Amino acid sequence: LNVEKINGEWFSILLASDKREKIEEHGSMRVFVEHIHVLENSLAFKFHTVIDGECSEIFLVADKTEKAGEYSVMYDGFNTFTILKTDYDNYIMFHLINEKDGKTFQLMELYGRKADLNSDIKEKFVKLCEEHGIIKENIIDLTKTNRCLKAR
Numbered sequence: 001l002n003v004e005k006i007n008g009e010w011f012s013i014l015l016a017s018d019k020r021e022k023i024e025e026h027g028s029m030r031v032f033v034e035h036i037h038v039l040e041n042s043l044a045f046k047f048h049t050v051i052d053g054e055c056s057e058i059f060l061v062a063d064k065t066e067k068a069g070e071y072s073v074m075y076d077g078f079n080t081f082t083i084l085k086t087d088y089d090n091y092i093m094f095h096l097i098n099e100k101d102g103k104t105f106q107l108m109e110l111y112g113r114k115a116d117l118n119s120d121i122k123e124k125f126v127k128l129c130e131e132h133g134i135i136k137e138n139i140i141d142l143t144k145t146n147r148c149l150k151a152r
């Protein structure tokens with residue numbers, strides 16, 4: 001991974017979790033990326049989210065941890081994440097682990113440089129989710145939901 005090449009604008013495409021409530025319409029992890037800025041020691045994200053039907057912004061900065069490739073950020077508990085796969089100019093796949101209260105769950109996210117991605121890429125993501133114990137019923141195609149695109 002050449003992390004500098006993930007800089008710039010992205011769209012949230014598929015969102016998946018082994019704790020489905022977290023990514024349902026009112027879940028804390030139901031956020032829609034707008035950009036990722038690469039800094040020397042971190043990744044700075046801008047997201048939108050819907051709160052009571054209205055779009056709103058969320059900004060997070062994730063710091064490099066002591067494990068190469070891994071980043072951490074506080075948001076609804078303590079999160080660590082890695083980049084699973086990317087071609088830089090079309091798709092990126094993230095894997096995240098949340099811890100809160102002694103409990104954990106996984107999130108996986110597929111982002112695109114455009115507002116949609118083709119079915120081949122989506123199906124490959126779905127298979128990768130399954131490989132992490134995230135079942136097909138726990139993968140949401142955000143392109144058929146409110147992603148706050150009008151707010152970008």
Ligand SMILES: CCCC[C@H](CC)CO
Nearest residue numbers: 029030031075081094096
């Ligand atoms: C890299 C994943 C960012 C995930 C996000 C904020 C922690 C929630 O969907």
Ligand SMILES: [Cl-]
Nearest residue numbers: 146147148149
């Ligand atoms: Cl939308």
